[PDB]
Amino acid sequence: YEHTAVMPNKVGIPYKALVERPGYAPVHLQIQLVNTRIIPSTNLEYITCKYKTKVPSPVVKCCGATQCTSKPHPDYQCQVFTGVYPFMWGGAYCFCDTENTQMSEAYVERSEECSIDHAKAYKVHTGTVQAMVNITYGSVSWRSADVYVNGETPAKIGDAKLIIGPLSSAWSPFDNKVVVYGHEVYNYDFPEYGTGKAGSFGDLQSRTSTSNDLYANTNLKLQRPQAGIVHTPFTQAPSGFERWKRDKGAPLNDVAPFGCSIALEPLRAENCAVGSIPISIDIPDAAFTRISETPTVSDLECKITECTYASDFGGIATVAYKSSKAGNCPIHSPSGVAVIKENDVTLAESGSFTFHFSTANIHPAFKLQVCTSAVTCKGDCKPPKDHIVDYPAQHTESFT
Amino acid sequence: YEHTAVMPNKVGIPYKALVERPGYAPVHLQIQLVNTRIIPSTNLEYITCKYKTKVPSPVVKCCGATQCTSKPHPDYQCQVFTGVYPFMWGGAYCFCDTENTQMSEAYVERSEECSIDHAKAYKVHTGTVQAMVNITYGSVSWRSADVYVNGETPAKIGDAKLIIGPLSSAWSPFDNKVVVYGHEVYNYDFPEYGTGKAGSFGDLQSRTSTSNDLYANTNLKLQRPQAGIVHTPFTQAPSGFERWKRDKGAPLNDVAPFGCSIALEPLRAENCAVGSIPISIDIPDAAFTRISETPTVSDLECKITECTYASDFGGIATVAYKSSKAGNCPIHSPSGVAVIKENDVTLAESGSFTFHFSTANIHPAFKLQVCTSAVTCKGDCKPPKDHIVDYPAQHTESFT
Amino acid sequence: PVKAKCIATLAPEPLVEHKHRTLILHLHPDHPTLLTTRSLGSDANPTRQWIERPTTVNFTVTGEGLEYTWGNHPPKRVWAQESGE
Numbered sequence: 001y002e003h004t005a006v007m008p009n010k011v012g013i014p015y016k017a018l019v020e021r022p023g024y025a026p027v028h029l030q031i032q033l034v035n036t037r038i039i040p041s042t043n044l045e046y047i048t049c050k051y052k053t054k055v056p057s058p059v060v061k062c063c064g065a066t067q068c069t070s071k072p073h074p075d076y077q078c079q080v081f082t083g084v085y086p087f088m089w090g091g092a093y094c095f096c097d098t099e100n101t102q103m104s105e106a107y108v109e110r111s112e113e114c115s116i117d118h119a120k121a122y123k124v125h126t127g128t129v130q131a132m133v134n135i136t137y138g139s140v141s142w143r144s145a146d147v148y149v150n151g152e153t154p155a156k157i158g159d160a161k162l163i164i165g166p167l168s169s170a171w172s173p174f175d176n177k178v179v180v181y182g183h184e185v186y187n188y189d190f191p192e193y194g195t196g197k198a199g200s201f202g203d204l205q206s207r208t209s210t211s212n213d214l215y216a217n218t219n220l221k222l223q224r225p226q227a228g229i230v231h232t233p234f235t236q237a238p239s240g241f242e243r244w245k246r247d248k249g250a251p252l253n254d255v256a257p258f259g260c261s262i263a264l265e266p267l268r269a270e271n272c273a274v275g276s277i278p279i280s281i282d283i284p285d286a287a288f289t290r291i292s293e294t295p296t297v298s299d300l301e302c303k304i305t306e307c308t309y310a311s312d313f314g315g316i317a318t319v320a321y322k323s324s325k326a327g328n329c330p331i332h333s334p335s336g337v338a339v340i341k342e343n344d345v346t347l348a349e350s351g352s353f354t355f356h357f358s359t360a361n362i363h364p365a366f367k368l369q370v371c372t373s374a375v376t377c378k379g380d381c382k383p384p385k386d387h388i389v390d391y392p393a394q395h396t397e398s399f400t
Numbered sequence: 401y402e403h404t405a406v407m408p409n410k411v412g413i414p415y416k417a418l419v420e421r422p423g424y425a426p427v428h429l430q431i432q433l434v435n436t437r438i439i440p441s442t443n444l445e446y447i448t449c450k451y452k453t454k455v456p457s458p459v460v461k462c463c464g465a466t467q468c469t470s471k472p473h474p475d476y477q478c479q480v481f482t483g484v485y486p487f488m489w490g491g492a493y494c495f496c497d498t499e500n501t502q503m504s505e506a507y508v509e510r511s512e513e514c515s516i517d518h519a520k521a522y523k524v525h526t527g528t529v530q531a532m533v534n535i536t537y538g539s540v541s542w543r544s545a546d547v548y549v550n551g552e553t554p555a556k557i558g559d560a561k562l563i564i565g566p567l568s569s570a571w572s573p574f575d576n577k578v579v580v581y582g583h584e585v586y587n588y589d590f591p592e593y594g595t596g597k598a599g600s601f602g603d604l605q606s607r608t609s610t611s612n613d614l615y616a617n618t619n620l621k622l623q624r625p626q627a628g629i630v631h632t633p634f635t636q637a638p639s640g641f642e643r644w645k646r647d648k649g650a651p652l653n654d655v656a657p658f659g660c661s662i663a664l665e666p667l668r669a670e671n672c673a674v675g676s677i678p679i680s681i682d683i684p685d686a687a688f689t690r691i692s693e694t695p696t697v698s699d700l701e702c703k704i705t706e707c708t709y710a711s712d713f714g715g716i717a718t719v720a721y722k723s724s725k726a727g728n729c730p731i732h733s734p735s736g737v738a739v740i741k742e743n744d745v746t747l748a749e750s751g752s753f754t755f756h757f758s759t760a761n762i763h764p765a766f767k768l769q770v771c772t773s774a775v776t777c778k779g780d781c782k783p784p785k786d787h788i789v790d791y792p793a794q795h796t797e798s799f800t
Numbered sequence: 801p802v803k804a805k806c807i808a809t810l811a812p813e814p815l816v817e818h819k820h821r822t823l824i825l826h827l828h829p830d831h832p833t834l835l836t837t838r839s840l841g842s843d844a845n846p847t848r849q850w851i852e853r854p855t856t857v858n859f860t861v862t863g864e865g866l867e868y869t870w871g872n873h874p875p876k877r878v879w880a881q882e883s884g885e
């Protein structure tokens with residue numbers, strides 16, 4: 001009875017399949033893939049952020065030169081300068097007039113915002129998708145368990161053992177190269193660590209926040225201070241993190257395909273509705289009811305009464321139930337034409353009980369399996385009027 | 401002069417290329433890829449180890465039942481038992497004879513060896529390879545720096561800036577799935593966390609050593625103690641960590657291809673000699689000698705004298721040096737036929753100095769570039785006799 | 801259980817014997833020794849055999865090299881280029 005089932009990847013709607021175990025009473029499913037969070041394999045390549053030209057205070061030798069050296073600070077720009085007369089609080093102070101030397105030095109450093117407000121590149125591989133699958137199973141009526149997709153993983157949470165996927169729809173909405181910012185995720189071809197052109201994205205490129213080493217192509221060019229005054233002309237491109245916040249591109253949670261949402265959290269891409277998942281469950285046999293205890297319902301009749309050719313469960317149909325005992329009777333349309341809101345219907349001794357459903361074909365000729373009794377609920381449906389609210393329960397469009 | 405060079409990946413031998421900068425004197429290389437440690441991208445999936453059935457001490461109710469509950473211990477096997485008469489130091493002690501109840505309980509727990517003697521699975525991706533490249537450069541004569549392979553990374557250690565790879569030979573000798581044990585690394589399709597069949601590898605599956613939760617499919621089945629005596633029959637498969645130590649497979653440092661060694665260290669695979677690496681260096685121009693200061697050597701002559709058709713530098717050749725000044729003269733065979741032990745030869749005023757080399761073609765027609773003077777050192781070579789010692793310097797086999 | 805370095809094993813040295821791209825190895829251990837190799841071509845072609853009985857073995861070494869592991873004695877390596885003249 002290990003109920004294999006191909007199953008559409010779509011998040012917010014149950015998939016009430018039916019266990020046709022030969023010998024005992026069938027049992028309905030209710031498989032709602034409440035989430036499709038993905039979490040691909042990734043690598044933190046480098047944080048970037050806007051620089052801060054945290055200038056070390058220049059040297060001023062008063063009569064003669066002060067040769068600079070290339071200190072190992074990131075992008076340590078330093079250039080000796082002569083021909084000053086530095087006004088500092090008493091007019092000038094160095095008594096020469098051309099031998100007055102000024103050595104400006106400036107290096108690039110991570111902002112304090114780099115720790116917290118920072119873009120973040122990644123090389124993104126495929127990884128392994130997940131889900132908090134609820135099944136309000138059978139008469140168990142509950143399990144809300146986190147699972148995987150790889151087609152040999154069980155998750156014995158509740159009582160049922162369930163194996164999912166691998167899904168066929170391998171579209172990772174993440175591209176190979178991704179930039180990430182706070183919550184807005186950008187599938188951007190970031191240039192690389194160690195290379196980013198100044199002004200362009202990744203002018204600062206630190207491996208992480210702690211990493212004292214980095215790559216700072218900022219085109220930081222010191223110029224001589226003017227007219228014998230102490231200061232430090234640092235001529236520099238404002239960061240490619242400054243832009244990339246107001247001349248950027250749009251976020252993947254606003255431009256992705258096939259229906260995904262995003263988080264700066266394990267780097268999941270939630271709820272990506274695409275393709276199918278070959279899902280298979282091993283039910284606990286204890287949860288089964290033996291066949292000789294559920295009422296046999298045959299010699300019945302089914303008919304629509306007001307079929308709504310729609311998404312919400314507007315389709316209805318009375319069923320002239322013709323039972324033997326009285327009790328519950330799980331139901332399902334093995335044809336995917338009709339999706340039913342009721343998993344189970346209570347029965348007195350051969351009464352009648354309408355259920356709700358939804359279809360996509362004008363003439364819904366769908367079988368209905370009322371606990372081992374098939375029936376065609378043939379009829380005709382009506383279009384609605386009022387179509388602006390969230391996503392459907394029908395999801396069965398085909399040739400009609 | 402940024403000397404691009406395709407370069408064979410092979411560890412223990414220099415690659416003495418030649419800088420042909422137009423305008424100043426050429427300079428030899430000596431690029432010895434002392435290491436090829438790899439460090440792919442990986443993930444600790446689960447430690448395994450042999451279980452320890454650290455039995456909690458059973459209950460013995462003397463007259464009537466003690467229902468057990470399924471405590472959340474890993475693989476908490478517990479089964480009530482009646483019909484005992486437990487001999488404990490005074491004969492039996494419970495005065496009933498069938499209402500004597502015994503509740504055995506046993507759960508699986510990590511051994512103390514699990515912390516230290518433990519296999520270790522991994523999902524292994526490709527990552528990024530490294531090397532402690534020595535270059536005893538030019539007249540610099542030294543730098544032993546750790547580098548990368550990704551073809552935009554410099555490493556300004558010494559004075560030269562050098563960019564390596566990416567290599568074309570992407571054979572990660574690690575497979576996707578790997579088990580690891582102390583030092584012996586096994587490219588094993590470990591089943592998974594959460595699944596491993598009892599007896600088979602990974603009967604115990606703990607995420608890490610600290611992780612109190614785990615997966616213990618050990619098929620632990622308690623049986624009733626015998627003949628009214630206190631004890632706990634635990635019937636169990638000895639671990640799939642017990643086997644996997646004496647019915648295992650062989651280690652990847654003993655079965656890998658293309659020449660690798662291994663460590664339980666950053667999970668590198670050292671010294672994997674395969675394929676080529678497109679390496680490019682930016683020399684310090686200060687290290688160059690201008691062309692008008694090295695002796696011009698032309699109007700020379702070269703000839704072998706005892707060419708050894710071999711690996712060790714057995715090939716020799718006098719050269720009738722015809723210099724202008726006197727001094728050093730870097731040398732190289734731009735053809736890969738001949739590999740030379742001497743990077744540089746000292747010269748008096750037009751003397752003669754033999755060098756050593758090794759070839760693979762019976763008639764070595766290789767050019768020799770003695771500091772901007774080419775010459776064919778044509779000749780013929782002799783096979784050796786004595787071939788059982790480590791790896792060659794020739795590495796140039798082709799059609800001969 | 802701690803990561804002590806036991807005073808530990810060592811197997812008697814091998815008798816290396818040359819042939820044309822081939823290591824004859826007359827070998828003579830103290831105890832059963834797992835020997836194994838790695839023909840360093842991308843064709844690995846490794847070998848494993850516990851040796852307790854003294855045995856002259858053979859190894860078709862290739863052009864580029866082979867390595868050789870006489871027990872926990874360190875791994876050796878070998879250039880076998882030509883010897884057939």
